[PDB]
């Protein structure tokens, strides 16, 4: 619009009567130049109050944005035209509008020292905590630029939001909380002992506030000065719903304070059955001990929470059963985790088979290595007196024999019948394994219950090759 082009220049120039003529003619009040500036942008950037008010009466978009997100309120605050600021807000300007850099009007007012404008912007709900791409707040800009009066004004406002926020989270003022967050309050501020608004909201049982704080980016796993997370406090005080929300939002179900106390310790200690079930269902480890060696089960037993003791006792039994089943099936992932939850690595079934036994019998070298480094007894015996090395030689798992011996497997161990690993290897014709056993110092003269030697068993089973080797070894 050529007519709108002259109106833009008429606003930059400041000719009220010329503008009035152009408004009665009908030239678009929201004309825009190449950048995106409208007649109301320039009336505010130059400081023509009367013109501004007149454009507002003809419905100039109070929140028009140029190609970089600058509104008329940005420009008025930049240049320091207080009368235009107050007017623009009277027409519903966005007090917290930000450009593509995240700069708000309060950034500009604070930087250039327009105290009166700063006071007004705050009176209309400006967020003191807003940060730009450089991470600067209006307080930091004032400070860095030497506006001590303004810096102290904003430093005092931030100090008040942190205090009022914490007091609201601890008091249950869901509305007051949501308000203070809009005003820039640091959602992750911490009191003298490190408690955040989330700690307090969980400690006091304000589910609503816990939901708001999380939606706004609160650290769900925030630690006080001693390692207590909000999940700790929710379990301590016993707020099922909060415990659920936190876990849904990524809470550390096994987080431990400086005393090794986890949330499960506290639920069991203070008899919060429902929360105990939620924590176990979400991966809580039953084997965790505090600095006194007490597990969650010890604390329920010591504190008289029997039904909770039963559940934890069952959970322990279930993990040691699943570990045996995982070791057999060949599920390294299931094994590794079950070991973390607290599954006894040296547990045994009815036969006396341990997870290591099952792993050697089924030929799961991966799972074998996991158990060994986790302290699995290499020379564990079953009712038959079998060692994992026995089962390995029985089945021909070469690599599992090497790893077992590597980790100290009794090479000359004998079962109840006196059978040794070398007997099995020669009996079942595992040439390569016979070479490893003898190379690892295996007894060649060993006799079983029948006086038979590994060579004799190589004869009876008719493995010439292994026979010639045992014959050469002797």
Residue numbers in the entry: 12 to 485
Copy out sentences from the published article reporting this entry, exactly as the authors wrote them.
In this paper, we present a strategy to fuse specific, high-affinity protein binders to obtain multivalent or multispecific scaffolds of predetermined geometry. DARPins are used as building blocks to confer the desired specificity to the construct. A series of rigid connector modules replacing the DARPin capping repeats allow to combine the individual DARPin domains in such a way that their distance and angle can be altered to test different geometries, bringing the binding partners of the DARPins into a defined spatial arrangement. The two helices are not just joined end-to-end, but instead the two domains are made to overlap in such a way that the joining helix is stabilized by contacts with the domain cores along its entire length.
D12_H12_D12_H12_D12 crystallized under several different conditions; three structures were determined in space groups P212121, P21, and P3221 at resolutions between 2.4 Å and 2.6 Å. The structure of D12_H12_D12_H12_D12 was determined in three different space groups (P212121, P21, and P3221), which gives an estimate of the impact of crystal lattice forces on the shape of the molecule. Rmsds between chemically identical D12_H12_D12_H12_D12 constructs vary between 1.6 and 2.9 Å. A comparison of three structures of the same construct (D12_H12_D12_H12_D12), determined in different crystal lattices, shows that differences between the structures (rmsds up to 3 Å) are caused by crystal lattice forces. The deviations between different crystal forms are of the same magnitude as the deviations between structures and model. The structures of these DDD fusions are very extended in one direction (>110 Å from N- to C-terminus), and thus amplify the effects of small deviations in the inter-domain angles, making the agreement with the designs even more remarkable. The rmsd for the comparison between design and crystal structure of DDD constructs with H06, H12 and H15 ranges from 1.5 to 4.2 Å. Considering the elongated shape of the DDD molecules, which amplifies the effect of small deviations in the connector, they agree remarkably well with the designs.
